[PDB]
RNA sequence: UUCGGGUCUUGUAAUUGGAAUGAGUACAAUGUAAAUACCUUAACGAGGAACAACUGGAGGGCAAGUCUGGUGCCAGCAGCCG
RNA sequence: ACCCACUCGGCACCUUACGAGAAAUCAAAGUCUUUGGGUUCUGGGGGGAGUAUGGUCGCAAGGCUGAAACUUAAAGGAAUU
């Protein structure tokens, strides 16, 4: 009889399974951003949709009306923080025009790739999974982390691991050992 | 015009009329009369276990011709006798007389499948093990 | 040009038509002891036409014995030949 | 090359008509497909389907192929062509031409607040052909085309970015549906909206300004 | 079969049924 | 027996020991390469599984 | 003038090369009522035969073959059309 | 009593639809995705079946009321060569 825990399904499947063009688009997207699943894409889409729902609702209310002024503004701020909206477009009307690419071009994946540190997206992903790459001296394991624009300045290798300068570890170490008494 | 009443105080008529009409919608009727419990061999349930009486080959409907390999089953829960199709090429010789079998529906919601006349049920599991598993040779039938 | 007579294999039986039932079914008195409800299986619905007291090569259904398949048909000469060879118990009379 | 019958065609060839806009304005009948080509260089041609269409004779049956073609850019211009011929390629080609000939303008509009560049339709518009009624509804930005794939393609061709649909009747007979959609699209111009209230000039037609350039002498 | 004839047949059947019922009673 | 004859008849052909497919994100990458990076041999109507005959 | 260097970019080969890693194990220390497990970590822990992804499909609906054997209105498949 | 012209009410009809409709056709079967004048009744794939049963009304024949199991991928409409 303890208080229930809240779950939420964070993605939504397409309403039509084998829409070929759509499928191809999805594939292309995956290729672009080193996505393990269509599931990731779906998640992103769902997120976008949620935002859109909010925005539309806000629009439906009169402009300069309190609720719109507040909630909508907050949403806009959030978007700007995340780095999906640009400073030109703090508008709420522009929130509807966002599209899936802007969210994917903001993952700790893509960001990692686009700052050096990588050589292709797959490599970056591997690095992320492998516990290389820290943000604010905090090692991030998550490929789809959503880099918060002000933290984007701080993406670097960890103080642990090689690459960012510590003990080589595992394979290199083994090699060294082998070299040692020979 | 339009057959329905429209007036701001009609409401009741709209309700009652709708209720009356609803009975022409078959699914609704089924739900309300409770024909899933009173009739139907499965007691409104997704699956049922039964004991194999005998193995019967059934001749398919027209355009087609082939002996289908079904099984006459008597269900444990009520005692009603039903025909159940045994899917896949071998499989009929996995069954035998006096064997406990798990039957699902066919996939037509009470109606008969394809060309097999009077058969409304699949065979899923014999003596506790999946037919598919047996067929693919992933497990063996642990006698009866 | 001539046709050949084909002998019965294991799971097969020589039968005679007793009566015309309908829907593609024939009551067959098998030369074994049993009088079975022999269902005409696909191939002989098409062209190979039955009579009344004709000899038919019946394939026995392994799991269910009262119902059986009909595979092949013989005329009168063929029947006689079979009798001579000792394939049939002697009562095969085809002259219609 | 090309040598034109019809005055309009001749005018087009001359260069006296700069855009199809003028033609649209003066409701001038486009009867040569080359005019369209000249004036709209950027037309994408989408073949919707090819279906068999049969006629019983004493010996066998004559089968013909019905080609349904939609044509357009992304700037409010669409054509729809139905053509039956025995050869499939030929049918397709003819259909394309027909579509081009048809080509219609679209009243693209805003959902709410005219922020920048119209995305949707200006009004809720319906079109009816056969039994198929296709209702098209102005959608908010970034909602996409919400349509049965056939209609969706047409919408895309037209250049509508965001639109809701409510296709009713026997939509499965695709040709009819397409026709209905086309009709609906057409209807967008011909709706008298408050931002069109005020009376204008009535310009002399390009068929009358350049009457001398018309006719081969 | 004509619908009228079917109806007639049904009626005939019903007469017999009625008779049977009466007998039972 | 009438039942299960075709299966019995068929020659028991064994699966060839192959190099394993790179499962996951790698697989997706591979697919992408096959389709939209290489764009190898395009007929107009771009085919997926062509027959070797 | 025929090549071709291929100066630049791509894919494919049981070719070959150093790097990276947690899945496991495991000193410890956390954790904990005492423990598990997590999070943290000394030590071990990757080269195809491994540290092997399955589940369903490839006529249409509906993404994907008129490839190769077998079967021959049979065995079967097929929600529907077949 | 005719004749002409107008006018209400009626049985219809003729031609066009600019409207409807799947079409045959329709001055309503129009003023319906540009959907709301007021209202009563009836239908919700085809069979089973206007059957079974229970009422009720009939001297009786019958009427009014009226199922389900099960069955089936069509039954139908208008037009086409
Ligand atoms: Mg570490
Ligand atoms: Mg497989
Ligand atoms: Mg299969
Ligand atoms: Mg296959
Ligand atoms: Mg396909
Ligand atoms: Mg009904
Ligand atoms: Mg008719």
The rounded distance, in Å, linking the Cα atoms of B107 and D201 is 68
| Closest to C10 (Cα-Cα) out of C81, C62, C64 | C62
Sequence ranges of the domains in chain C: 1-96
The answer to whether D136 touches D121, Cβ cutoff 8 Å, is: yes
Q: Per residue, what are the HEC states of C28-66? A: EEECCCCEEEEEECCHHHHCCCCCCCCEEEEEECCCCCC
Q: Tell me the residues surrounding ligand 1 (ion) with CB < 5 Å.
A: A 160
| Closest to D158 (Cα-Cα) out of D197, D203, D102 | D102
Closest CA to the C1' of H39: that residue is B5
Confirm or deny that D40 is annotated as ligand binding. Answer: no
- Partners of D162 in beta bridges: none
| Closest-approach nucleotide to residue F39, Cα vs C1' | G11
Half-sphere exposure of D96 (CA within 13 A, CB side): 13
CA of B89, nearest ligand number: 3
- Partners of A78 in beta bridges: none
The answer to whether D161 touches D169, Cβ cutoff 8 Å, is: no
Highest CATH level, class, for D1-105: alpha beta
Chain B residues in contact with F3 by the CB 8 A cut-off are 69, 89-93
Show which subunits contact D, needing at least 3 CB pairs below 8 angstroms.
A
Closest CA to the C1' of H67: that residue is B33
The count of residues in chain D is 217
What lies within 8 Å, CB to CB, of B69 at 6+ separation is B55, B57, B58, B85, B86, B91, B92, C63, F2, F3
The rounded distance, in Å, linking the Cα atoms of B88 and B126 is 14
Q: List all nucleotides in chain H with at least one atom under 7 A from a protein Cβ.
A: 21-23, 33-45, 50-53, 61-62, 68-73, 80-81
Q: What is the DSSP-derived secondary structure letter of residue A96?
A: G
Straight-line distance from CA A18 to C1' G57, in Å?
Answer: 12
Mutate to test the interface with B, among C58, C63, C67 (most CBs of B within 10 A): C63
Closest CA to the C1' of H37: that residue is B1
CA of A163, nearest ligand number: 1
Q: What is the number of other CB atoms lying within 10 angstroms of the CB of residue D32? A: 20
Residues of chain F that touch chain C, judged by Cβ-Cβ distance less than 8 Å = 1-3
B–A touching, 3+ CB–CB pairs within 8 Å: no
Tokens coding B118: 């009077």
Helix (H, G, I), strand (E, B) or coil at D141: coil
Q: Is the dihedral of CA A166, A168, A169, A173 positive or negative?
A: negative
DSSP F2-53: -TTHHHHHS--PPPP--PPP--SHHHHHHHHIIIIIS--S--SS--SS----
What is each CA distance from D7 to D3, D203, F37, in whole angstroms?
11, 19, 50
> F3, C61: Cβ pair inside 8 Å?
no
- Partners of D85 in beta bridges: D65
The answer to whether B86 touches B38, Cβ cutoff 8 Å, is: no
What lies within 8 Å, CB to CB, of E6 at 6+ separation is none
| Closest-approach nucleotide to residue B22, Cα vs C1' | H44
The count of residues in chain B is 144
Chain A residues in contact with D142 by the CB 8 A cut-off are 52, 96-99
CA of B29, nearest ligand number: 6
Torsion angle in degrees (nearest 10) through CA of D185, D186, D188, D190 = -170
How many angstroms separate the CA of residue B106 from the nearest CA in chain C? 23
Chain C residues in contact with F2 by the CB 8 A cut-off are 59, 61-63, 69
Q: What angle do CA A138, A142, A143 make, to 5 degrees?
A: 125
Residue A139: alpha-carbon gap to chain centroid: 16
How many angstroms separate the CA of residue C57 from the nearest CA in chain B? 18
Sequence ranges of the domains in chain D: 1-105, 106-199
Resolution, angstroms, 1 dp: 3.5
* Residues of D (88-117) whose Cβ lies below 8 Å from A: 112-113, 115
E–B touching, 3+ CB–CB pairs within 8 Å: no
* Residues of C (31-70) whose Cβ lies below 8 Å from B: 39, 41-42, 45, 61, 63-64, 67, 69
> F7, B89: Cβ pair inside 8 Å?
yes
H or E element at residue D179:
helix D174-187
Reading across the β-sheet that carries D132-138, which strands appear in turn? D125-129, D132-138, D163-168, D145-146
Using left for φ > 0, alpha for ψ between -120 and 50, and beta otherwise, residue B127 falls in left
Helix (H, G, I), strand (E, B) or coil at D132: strand
The rounded distance, in Å, linking the Cα atoms of B95 and F4 is 13
> D140, A59: Cβ pair inside 8 Å?
yes
Counting other chains too, the contacts that D209-213 makes at CB distance below 8 Å and 24 or more residues apart are D209/D16, D210/D11, D210/D14, D210/D16, D213/D10, D213/D11, D213/D14, D213/D16
Helix (H, G, I), strand (E, B) or coil at A181: coil
Q: At residue F28, what are phi and psi to the nearest 5 degrees?
A: -60, -45
- Partners of D8 in beta bridges: none
The rounded distance, in Å, linking the Cα atoms of D119 and A27 is 27
Question: How close is the Cα of D160 to the center of ligand 5, in Å?
Answer: 28
Burial C30-59 (b: 16+ CB within 10 A, else e): bbeeeebebbbbbebeeeeeeeeebbbbbb
What is each CA distance from B67 to A78, B74, B89, C49, D112, in whole angstroms?
67, 22, 12, 21, 66
What is each CA distance from C6 to B103, C12, C69, F5, in whole angstroms?
42, 11, 16, 21
Residue C15: alpha-carbon gap to chain centroid: 4
Residue that has been written with the tokens 């880099």 in this structure: A147
DSSP B91-124: -GGGT-SS-EEEEEE-SSTTSPPTT-TT--EEEE
Sequence ranges of the domains in chain B: 1-144
The answer to whether A147 touches A106, Cβ cutoff 8 Å, is: yes
The answer to whether F34 touches F50, Cβ cutoff 8 Å, is: no
The rounded distance, in Å, linking the Cα atoms of D120 and C55 is 79
The answer to whether B124 touches B69, Cβ cutoff 8 Å, is: no
Q: What is the number of other CB atoms lying within 10 angstroms of the CB of residue D16? A: 15
The answer to whether D69 touches D90, Cβ cutoff 8 Å, is: no
How many angstroms separate the CA of residue B142 from the nearest CA in chain F? 20
Half-sphere exposure of F4 (CA within 13 A, CB side): 13
| Closest to D215 (Cα-Cα) out of D8, D31, D36 | D8
Tokens coding D161: 């970015």
Chain B residues in contact with C42 by the CB 8 A cut-off are 65-66
Tell me the fold of D106-199. Answer: Ribosomal Protein S5; domain 2 (3.30.230)
Sequence ranges of the domains in chain A: 17-182
What is each CA distance from D113 to A90, D74, D129, D165, in whole angstroms?
15, 22, 33, 21
Chain F residues in contact with A31 by the CB 8 A cut-off are 28-29, 31-33, 36-37
CATH number of C1-96: 2.40.50.140
Torsion angle in degrees (nearest 10) through CA of D188, D9, D83, D133 = 10
- Partners of B48 in beta bridges: B103
| Closest-approach nucleotide to residue F30, Cα vs C1' | G11
The overall longest dimension of chain C from CA atoms, in Å, is 39
Straight-line distance from CA C12 to C1' H2, in Å?
Answer: 105
Q: What angle do CA B89, B90, B96 make, to 5 degrees?
A: 135
Instruction: Report the residue from A19, A91, A97 with minimal CB separation from D142.
Output: A97
| Closest to B70 (Cα-Cα) out of B88, B43, B44, B46 | B88
Straight-line distance from CA A109 to C1' H31, in Å?
Answer: 63
The rounded distance, in Å, linking the Cα atoms of D77 and D103 is 6
What is each CA distance from C77 to A24, B134, C29, C93, in whole angstroms?
70, 49, 20, 10
Torsion angle in degrees (nearest 10) through CA of A81, A87, A89, A95 = -10
Q: What is the DSSP-derived secondary structure letter of residue A71?
A: I
What lies within 8 Å, CB to CB, of B73 at 6+ separation is B50, B51, B52, B53, B81, B82, B83, B84, B101, B103, B121
Tokens coding D159: 């250049």
The count of residues in chain C is 96
Q: Is A104 exposed, middle or buried (0-12, 13-18, 19+ CB in 10 A)?
A: buried
Tokens coding A89: 């477009």
| Closest to A83 (Cα-Cα) out of A101, A68, A67, A96 | A101
State the alpha helices, DSSP H only, in A12-169: 20-33, 38-60, 66-67, 73-82, 101-104, 108-114, 121-129
Straight-line distance from CA B27 to C1' H44, in Å?
Answer: 12
C62 → chain F, closest CA residue: F1
| Closest-approach nucleotide to residue B63, Cα vs C1' | G73
Q: Is D37 exposed, middle or buried (0-12, 13-18, 19+ CB in 10 A)?
A: middle
Chain A residues in contact with F37 by the CB 8 A cut-off are 31
């Amino acid at each position: 009889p303890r208080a229930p825990r809240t779950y939420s399904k964070t993605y939504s499947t397409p309403k039509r399974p084998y829409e070929s063009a759509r499928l191809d688009a999805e594939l292309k997207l995956a290729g672009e951003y080193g996505l393990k699943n269509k599931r990731e894409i779906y998640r992103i889409s769902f997120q976008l949709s949620k935002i859109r729902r909010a925005a539309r609702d806000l629009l439906t209310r009169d402009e300069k009306d309190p609720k719109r002024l507040f909630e909508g503004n907050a949403l806009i701020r959030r978007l700007v923080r995340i780095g999906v909206l640009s400073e030109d477009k703090k508008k709420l009307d522009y929130v509807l025009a966002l599209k899936v690419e802007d969210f994917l071009e903001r993952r700790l994946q893509t960001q990692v790739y686009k700052l050096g540190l990588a050589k292709s997206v797959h490599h970056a992903r591997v690095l992320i999974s492998q516990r290389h790459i820290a943000v604010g001296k905090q090692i991030v394991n998550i490929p789809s982390f959503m880099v918060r624009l002000e933290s984007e300045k701080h993406i670097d290798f960890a103080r642990t691991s090689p690459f960012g300068g510590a003990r080589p570890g595992r394979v290199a170490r083994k090699r060294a050992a082998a070299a040692g008494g020979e | 015009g339009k057959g329905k009443p429209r007036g701001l105080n009609s409401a009741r008529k709209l309700r009652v009329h709708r209720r009356n009409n609803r009975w022409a919608e078959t699914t609704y009727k089924k739900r309300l009369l409770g024909t899933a419990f009173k009739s139907s061999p499965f007691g409104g349930s997704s699956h049922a276990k039964g004991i194999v009486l005998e193995k019967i080959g059934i001749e398919s409907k027209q355009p087609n011709s082939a002996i289908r390999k079904c099984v006459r089953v008597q269900l444990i829960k009520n005692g009603k006798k039903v025909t159940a199709f045994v899917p896949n090429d071998g499989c009929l010789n996995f069954v035998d007389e006096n064997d406990e079998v798990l039957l699902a529906g066919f996939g037509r919601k009470g109606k008969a499948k394809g060309d097999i006349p009077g058969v409304r049920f699949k065979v899923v599991k014999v003596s506790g093990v999946s037919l598919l598993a047996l067929w693919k040779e992933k497990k063996e039938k642990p006698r009866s | 040009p001539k046709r050949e007579l084909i002998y019965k294999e294991e799971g097969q039986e020589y039968a005679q038509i007793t009566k015309m039932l309908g829907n593609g079914r024939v009551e067959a008195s098998c030369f074994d002891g049993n009088k079975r409800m022999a269902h005409i299986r696909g191939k002989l619905r098409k062209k190979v036409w039955m009579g009344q007291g004709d000899i038919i090569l019946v394939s026995l259904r392994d799991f269910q014995d009262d119902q059986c398949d009909v595979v092949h048909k013989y005329n009168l000469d063929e029947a006689r030949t079979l009798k001579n060879q000792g394939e049939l118990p002697e009562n095969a009379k085809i002259n219609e | 090359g090309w040598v034109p019958v019809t005055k309009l065609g001749r005018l087009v060839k001359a260069g006296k008509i700069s855009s199809i806009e003028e033609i649209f304005l003066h409701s001038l009948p486009v009867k040569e497909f080359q005019i369209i080509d000249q004036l709209l260089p950027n037309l994408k041609d989408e073949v919707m389907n090819i279906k068999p269409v049969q006629k019983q004779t004493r010996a066998g049956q004559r089968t013909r192929f019905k080609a349904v073609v939609v044509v357009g850019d992304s700037n409010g211009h669409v054509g729809l062509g139905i053509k039956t011929a025995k050869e499939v390629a030929g049918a397709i080609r003819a259909g394309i031409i027909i579509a081009k000939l048809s080509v219609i303008p679209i009243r693209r509009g805003y959902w709410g607040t005219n922020l920048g560049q119209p995305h949707s339709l200006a009004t809720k518009t319906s079109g009816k052909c056969g039994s198929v009624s296709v209702r098209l509804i102005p959608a908010p930005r970034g909602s996409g085309i919400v349509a049965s794939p056939a209609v969706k393609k047409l919408m895309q061709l037209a250049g509508v970015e965001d639109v809701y649909t409510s296709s009713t009747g026997s939509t499965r007979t695709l040709e009819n549906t397409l026709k209905a959609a086309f009709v609906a699209i057409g209807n967008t111009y011909g709706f008298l909206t408050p931002n069109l209230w005020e009376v204008q000039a009535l310009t002399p037609s390009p068929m009358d300004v350049y009457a001398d350039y018309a006719t081969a002498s | 079969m004509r619908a009228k004839w079917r109806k007639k047949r049904t009626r005939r059947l019903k007469r017999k049924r009625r008779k049977v019922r009466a007998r039972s009673k | 027996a009438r039942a299960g004859k075709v299966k019995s008849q068929t020659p028991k052909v064994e699966k060839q020991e192959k190099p394993k497919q790179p499962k996951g994100r790698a697989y997706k990458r591979l697919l992408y390469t096959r389709r939209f990076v290489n764009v190898t041999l395009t007929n107009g109507k771009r085919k997926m599984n062509p027959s070797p005959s």
